[PDB]
Design a protein around this ligand. Structure first.
Ligand SMILES: Cc1cc2nc3c(=O)[nH]c(=O)nc-3n(C[C@H](O)[C@H](O)[C@H](O)COP(=O)(O)O)c2cc1C
Ligand code: SF4
Lengths: 62, 129, 432
């Protein structure tokens, strides 16, 4: 809730990288279910979360 | 300036009798004057420059021996190219053919702005690149 | 009158006085070292005055391009329409050989945070987003701690420094992509997308982060702004040659006795910089093979050129290279120069974003050819083929990374072609 309020209203998708990383810190890695959760919390299509996870190397998909 | 005697003929040009076309393929045929549509699989527009005149498709059946595609239409493969619509109608009228003319369909100009992909308060913003 | 030799900067003129973390980085240590002093007067002086001080200062970007900062920051000095205005501070230091921005963040955080406010006031910005790469976790935490102290002291936030100007400072962490150092790829990452650069136009000053006006300034370019305004542009412009003024942070790394980060005056001769601060090359200056003046993105130069070349934008351009990020990578005669540069091409193959054809397909192509030059499994006719391939990437790509992959190869072919052909001759003899 603090992360999503660092960005202008109407641009919640800007929080994908922080939240998707916060998911990994809690869980140690990012399963497909973790990505789908961040998609619905931020209300962005799940594919747009898959793109970020696969693009960046600090996200562990295994 | 031509030092040769000329005459005046007020009748429309009609060569149907001096072309050798059987009457079946003058009166019963429907020419189609059109600019070919762009092949949608490709982005090139170099086949949409000239007018074409095609005729009405007729029966194609199966050769009993080999299964090939037989035909009894001598005009099945006839395609003529014209620079302008008027040149196409002029050629069909003097040959006695009945024609339909379809007006050219040019794609209307559009407003392309690469910056609209990153709009602050509009839906044109793209979710990915 | 105008100087003729440069170097030997005095500690009385060093902007980053805590470059080694020998004093208190937290607040009340920065203030004791001249930070956050008389900031309200600078803000109340006016955006035009602040920009005028940076234009006269001759400061140029320390991110790798070296554009005149004063000219760039004036693009946001325009009437404000309905949209907000932001300042993005590029702390994504990822250029191989570059470590200067890491030290500013972890030891002088309050210089960066003050620079955000001064830079923002010049641009009329409402907030600053500091993009710092995700591997700098501890450094990012130090920056976050400093920002909290600034807010509690009234230095930033509502009525910053009592100036009546509102300014927020947000820290945003990257997720491990070197391409996100690019000014437009960095913006895309902040917007929560893949770090793929945009095309220009539109420029960030007209359409940027969230579609609003934006300026991307490197950590060093911003951290020096408050000092320039306090000490004026004349003091900063008095260093270095004309159009190359200022004090620059250098990162001497590789085959040297004392690899270190040090602040030194612009136009300092490269030989003096290596010997005086880094303790010379490993094995003696005569054991020097080549130097990469400004990180991997710049082409290398051989020993014959390092003896009389100054470290500034203009001096290194005449040498067929660039200043870049002022990171000096030294290679001695025991180095495998072909393998040293081949690994740099392999770096760019791994950091290419894949967006555009000449770098998605070309930099990978140059990688495979280079991996065969290391072993000599090629014929000499391929060297000219590799020269043309690089020229088809350079200037045909969306962003400058494609240029950064071509330049290392061009330098190798330019100054070390005999080593390439010798390697292939050896391989041919054995497998005859
Ligand atoms: C592939 C690539 C990586 C870059 N990485 C950085 C970086 O890590 N830090 C930085 O300040 N500029 C980096 N830049 C340069 C930026 O594009 C831009 O010049 C800089 O953010 C502007 O800051 P300046 O005003 O100090 O020059 C990079 C450019 C490219 C093409
Ligand atoms: S040059 Fe490479 S990194 Fe830059 S936009 Fe093109 S593909 Fe992406």
């Amino acid at each position: 809730e603090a992360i999503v309020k660092n960005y202008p209203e109407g641009h919640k998708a800007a929080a994908v990288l922080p939240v998707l990383d916060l998911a990994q810190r809690q869980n140690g890695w990012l399963p497909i279910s973790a990505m789908n959760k961040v998609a619905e919390i931020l209300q962005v299509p799940p594919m747009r979360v898959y793109e970020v996870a696969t693009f960046y190397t600090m996200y562990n998909r295994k | 300036t031509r030092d040769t005697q000329l005459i005046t003929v007020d009748e429309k040009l009609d060569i149907t009798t001096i072309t050798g076309v059987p009457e079946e393929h003058i009166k019963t045929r429907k020419a189609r004057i059109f600019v070919p549509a762009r092949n949608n699989m490709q982005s090139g527009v170099n086949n949409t420059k000239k007018w074409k005149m095609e005729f009405d498709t007729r029966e194609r059946w199966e050769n009993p021996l080999m299964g090939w595609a037989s035909t009894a239409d001598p005009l099945s493969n006839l395609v003529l190219t014209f620079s302008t619509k008027e040149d196409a109608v002029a050629f069909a009228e003097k040959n006695g053919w009945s024609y339909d003319v379809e007006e050219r369909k040019v794609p209307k100009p559009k407003s392309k702005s690469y910056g609209a992909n990153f709009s602050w308060n509009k839906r044109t913003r793209v979710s990915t690149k | 009158p105008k100087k003729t030799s440069f170097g030997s900067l005095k500690d009385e003129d060093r902007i980053f006085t805590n470059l080694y973390g020998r004093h208190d980085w937290r607040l009340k240590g920065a203030q004791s070292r001249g930070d956050w002093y008389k900031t309200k007067e600078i803000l109340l002086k006016g955006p035009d005055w602040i920009l005028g001080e940076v234009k006269t200062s001759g400061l140029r970007g320390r991110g790798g391009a070296g554009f005149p900062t004063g000219l760039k920051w004036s693009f946001m000095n325009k009437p404000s329409d309905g949209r907000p205005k932001y300042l993005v501070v590029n702390a994504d230091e990822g250029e191989p050989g570059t470590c200067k921005d890491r030290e500013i963040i972890r030891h002088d955080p309050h210089k960066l945070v003050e620079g955000c406010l001064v830079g923002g006031r010049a641009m009329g910005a409402r907030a600053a987003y500091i993009y710092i790469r995700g591997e700098f976790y501890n450094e990012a935490s130090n920056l976050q701690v400093a920002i909290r102290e600034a807010y509690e002291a009234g230095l930033i936030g509502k009525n910053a420094c009592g100036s009546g100007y509102d300014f927020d400072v947000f820290v945003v962490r990257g997720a491990g992509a070197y391409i996100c150092g690019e000014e437009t790829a960095l913006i895309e990452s902040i917007e929560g997308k893949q770090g793929k650069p945009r095309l220009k136009p539109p420029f960030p000053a007209d359409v940027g982060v969230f579609g609003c006006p934006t300026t991307v300034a490197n950590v060093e370019t911003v951290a020096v702004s408050p000092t320039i305004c306090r000490r004026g542009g004349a003091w900063f412009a008095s260093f270095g040659r004309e159009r190359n003024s200022g004090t620059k942070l250098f990162n001497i790394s590789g085959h040297v006795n004392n690899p270190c980060t040090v602040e030194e005056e612009m136009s300092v001769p490269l030989k003096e910089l290596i010997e005086k601060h880094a303790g010379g090359v490993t094995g003696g200056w005569d054991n020097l093979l080549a130097v990469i003046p400004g990180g991997s993105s710049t082409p290398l130069i051989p020993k014959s050129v390092c003896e009389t070349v100054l470290m500034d934008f203009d001096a290194l351009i005449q040498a067929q290279t660039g200043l870049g990020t002022a990171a000096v990578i030294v290679m001695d005669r025991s180095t495998d120069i072909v393998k040293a540069i081949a690994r740099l091409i392999e770096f760019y193959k791994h950091e290419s974003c894949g967006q555009c054809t000449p770098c998605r397909e070309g930099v990978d192509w140059m990688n495979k050819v280079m991996a065969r030059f290391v072993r000599g499994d090629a014929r000499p006719a391929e060297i000219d083929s590799l020269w043309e391939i690089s020229k088809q990437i350079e200037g045909h790509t969306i962003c400058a990374l494609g240029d950064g992959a071509a330049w290392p190869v061009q330098g190798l072919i330019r100054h070390f072609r005999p080593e390439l052909e010798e390697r292939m001759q050896q391989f041919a003899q054995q497998h005859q």
